[PDB]
């Protein structure tokens, strides 16, 4: 009863058969979730659309992922991944930002319980690749407690609304290292030109930052 089901794709599939010619079947993609981190998806296939709905939603509840959420509202860090030809770039966001994502991602995020996130989908916009690509990236996100344990250091959160106050979000359960993390003068991290072009005011789009209904 705690789980809600959402449809992501309903397709009419046409099979050429030896004796009966072109036959019509239904392929359904559905997502399930309880809004508290437990969510899954499944494909359903039946001649009747309602049967395909019953198969997918009942199967999806047996293939549930657990998705870690920062403060039970957003992701722990920016996630950029490619699944086949579908690219998904997700950004951690503060409270009140809302879900500014592909409509299918919005639907899935409500089932997971994510309230604030930005996402951009590029390349092939294949619903199935996007769905399983999204779940793959959300299930492989490192939490702050995992980061502290891996590096044996404190994870300290700096918020501009709280000024210079250091907010320890995670501390290692094991011993605490005494050697500071090396300060590489310049990180060799790969950057997204879209993110940089926006920060430099060089990104001009009539479609970006448009007023939309609450999501």
């Amino acid at each position: 009863e705690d789980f809600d089901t959402r449809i992501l794709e309903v397709r009419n599939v046409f099979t050429m058969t030896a004796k009966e010619g072109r036959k019509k079947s239904i392929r359904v993609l559905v997502a399930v979730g309880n809004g508290k981190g437990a969510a899954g998806f499944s494909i359903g296939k039946a001649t009747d659309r309602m049967d395909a709905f019953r198969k997918a939603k009942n199967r999806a509840v047996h293939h549930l992922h657990y998705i870690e959420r920062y403060e039970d509202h957003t992701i722990f860090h920016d996630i950029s991944l490619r699944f086949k030809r579908t690219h998904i770039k997700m950004k951690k966001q503060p409270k009140g930002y809302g879900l500014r994502c592909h409509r299918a991602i919005i639907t899935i995020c409500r089932l997971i319980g994510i309230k604030d996130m930005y996402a951009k989908v590029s390349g092939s916009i294949n619903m199935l690749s996007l769905t399983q690509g999204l779940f793959r990236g959300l299930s492989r996100q490192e939490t702050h407690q995992q980061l502290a344990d891996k590096k044996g250091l404190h994870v300290v959160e700096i918020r501009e609304e709280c000024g210079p106050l250091p907010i320890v979000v995670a501390s290692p359960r094991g011993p605490l290292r005494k050697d500071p993390e090396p300060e590489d003068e310049v990180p060799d991290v790969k950057l997204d030109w879209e993110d940089v072009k926006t920060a430099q005011g060089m990104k001009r789009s009539v479609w970006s930052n448009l007023k939309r209904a609450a999501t």
């Binding site: 009863e1 809600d4 309602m50 709905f53 019953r54």
Partner: peptide, 14 residues
């Protein structure tokens, strides 16, 4: 919550 046609009647079983 929403209503979908049920799979079958339990009397319709072995």
């Amino acid at each position: 919550a929403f209503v979908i046609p049920k799979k079958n009647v339990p009397t319709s079983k072995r």
